[PDB]
C-alpha cells in the first residue's frame, strides 16, 4: 500500500516540530517497516497530482491541508482512506469520498484541551486589551488612557458558549473560576449544567458579553455569524472562534470590527486555509488572530501521531475504527 502525506515544511533549527516533512509524525519508519511505500509531499498541488493514480491513503492536517476535491478524488482509483492528522475534515469532499467509497477519519479527542486553552486565552487577550498593552510596551510607549480605554476585567462578564460539546465544556470548566456568568447553546446539550445555564441562540447572541464558538461546520453553522447575527450581538462585545473559519462571515466580521459594533475578534481558524497572505482577518482592527496551530500544540502532536498510527494499524488489518473517528464510513 502506498501512503502519501502532506505536512508543513521542516525548518533548520526547529528540531521540536513532529508534524513536518522531516520527522513526519514518525510514519517513515512506522510505514517503511511494514512493507509500505511512504511519500511525503513537499508539493501540495502539482506534486500531489503525480500520486493520485496510485495513492492508497492520503494524510494531512487541517492546519495545512491536502484538499481532496471531487476533481482529485476521481483521479485516485486506488484511494481508500483519507486520514486527517488532527481534527477537521472540511478539506475533503465528503459527498464524492462517499460516492467512491473512500473512508474519512480524523483523530477525535487528540487536541480538545489545547483548543480550550487557546480560547480562554483569546477571551483574556481580547478583554484585557493585551494587544494594546504589548504594542505600547514594544513601541517605546506608556499611555494608560489609550490602553485603559478598552481594558476590562474578565471577571463578572457573561460568556456565551456556542456549542457545548467536548471543547465547549472544557472551556466552561476553565472559565468557571474566573467569576463570570456562563451561558451555552447546543442543539442537544440543552439542560442547565453545573457550570453554565442553557440559553437560546437568540438569547446567547444578544445577552453575551463575548461569545466563543465550539460548534462543528454543519449546514447550519455554515456562514451562521453573517451580517445579521453579528448585527444582533451586543454592541462592544467580543467574538472568539477557534472552531472553523467559515462559521463566521469573512467580510461581515470586518465590517463589524471597523464600525466598532464588535470590540474585538480572536481565534486561529480560517477560510480558506492556509490563509492567503492578504487575508483581511490578518490586518483587521483589534484582532488577535494567530495562524492555525491551536490544535497543533507540541503535545497535541504526540496525540495526533499516536492516532494516525493506530488508525493505519487497524486499517491494515481490517479492524473496525472507534466511532469517534469516522467521518465518512466505507466498506
**Interface positions, 291-310, toward ligand NAD (CB under 6 A):** 294-295
Catalytic residue flag (residue 111) = yes
Binding mask 269-288 for ligand NAD (x = CB under 6 A): x-------------------
Of 279 and 314, CB closest to a copy of itself: 279
Q: Which of 220, 223, 215, 263 is nearest to 239 (CA)?
A: 263
Contacts of residue 5, defined as CB under 8 A and 6 or more positions apart, other chains included, come to 24, 25, 27, 38, 39, 40, 41, 58, 59, 60, 85
Give the one residue of 55, 161, 229, 296 binding a copy of itself; rule: CB under 8 A: 296
Q: Single out the segment in contact with ligand NAD by CB under 6 A; choices: 31-39, 76-84, 109-117, 273-281.
A: 109-117
Give how many residues touch a copy of itself by CB under 8 A.
72
Residue indicated by cell numbers 467580510: 251
Q: Which of 273, 286, 287, 301 is catalytic?
A: 273
Give the C-alpha separation, 266 to 122, whole Å: 6
DSSP secondary structure of 120-151? HHHHHHHHHTHHHHHHHHHHT---HHHHHTT-
Give the C-alpha separation, 180 to 175, whole Å: 7
The verdict on 221 binding a copy of itself (CB under 8 A) reads no
Q: Which of residues 145-174 bind ligand NAD (CB under 6 A)?
A: 162-163, 165-168
Residue 112 interacting entry, from ligand NAD, a copy of itself, none, C-beta within 5 to 8 Å by type: ligand NAD
Give the C-alpha separation, 228 to 242, whole Å: 21
CA distances 236 to 35, 72, 123, 317, Å, are 58, 44, 14, 55
Which residues of the chain form contacts with ligand NAD (CB under 6 A)?
87-88, 111-112, 115, 162-163, 165-168, 185-189, 214-216, 218, 220-221, 242-244, 268-269, 294-295
> Active-site residue numbers?
111, 244, 273, 292
Amino acid at each position: 500500500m502506498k501512503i502519501v502525506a502532506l505536512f508543513p515544511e521542516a525548518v533548520e533549527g526547529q528540531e521540536n516540530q513532529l508534524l513536518n516533512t522531516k520527522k513526519a509524525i514518525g510514519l517513515k519508519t512506522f510505514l517503511e517497516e511494514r512493507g509500505h511505500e511512504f511519500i511525503i509531499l513537499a508539493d501540495n498541488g502539482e506534486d500531489l497530482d503525480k500520486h493520485l493514480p496510485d495513492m492508497d491513503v492520503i494524510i494531512s492536517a487541517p492546519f495545512y491541508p491536502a484538499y481532496m476535491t471531487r476533481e482529485r478524488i476521481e483521479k485516485a482509483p486506488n484511494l481508500k482512506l483519507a486520514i486527517t492528522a488532527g481534527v477537521g475534515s472540511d478539506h475533503v469532499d465528503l459527498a464524492a469520498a462517499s460516492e467512491h467509497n473512500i473512508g474519512v477519519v480524523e483523530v477525535t479527542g487528540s487536541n480538545t484541551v489545547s483548543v480550550a486553552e487557546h480560547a480562554v486565552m483569546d477571551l483574556l487577550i481580547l478583554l484585557r486589551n493585551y494587544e494594546e498593552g504589548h504594542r505600547q510596551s514594544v513601541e517605546g510607549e506608556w499611555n494608560l488612557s489609550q490602553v485603559g480605554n478598552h481594558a476590562h476585567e474578565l471577571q463578572h462578564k457573561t460568556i456565551g458558549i456556542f456549542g457545548f460539546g467536548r471543547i465547549g465544556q472544557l472551556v466552561a470548566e476553565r472559565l468557571a473560576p474566573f467569576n463570570v456568568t456562563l451561558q451555552h447553546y447546543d442543539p442537544i446539550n440543552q439542560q442547565d449544567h453545573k457550570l453554565s445555564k442553557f440559553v437560546s441562540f437568540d438569547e446567547l447572541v444578544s445577552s453575551s458579553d463575548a461569545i466563543t464558538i465550539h460548534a462543528p461546520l454543519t449546514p447550519e453553522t455554515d456562514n451562521l455569524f453573517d451580517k445579521d447575527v453579528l448585527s444582533r450581538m451586543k454592541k462592544h462585545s467580543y467574538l472568539v472562534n477557534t472552531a472553523r473559519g467559515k462559521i463566521v462571515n469573512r467580510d461581515a466580521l470586518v465590517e463589524a470590527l471597523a464600525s466598532e459594533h464588535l470590540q474585538g475578534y480572536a481565534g486561529d481558524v480560517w477560510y480558506p486555509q492556509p490563509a492567503p497572505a492578504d487575508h483581511p482577518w490578518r490586518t483587521m482592527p483589534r484582532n488577535a488572530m494567530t495562524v492555525h496551530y491551536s490544535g497543533m500544540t507540541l503535545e497535541a502532536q504526540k496525540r495526533i501521531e499516536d492516532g494516525v498510527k493506530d488508525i493505519l494499524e487497524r486499517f491494515f488489518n481490517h479492524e473496525p475504527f472507534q466511532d469517534k473517528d469516522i467521518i465518512v464510513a466505507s466498506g
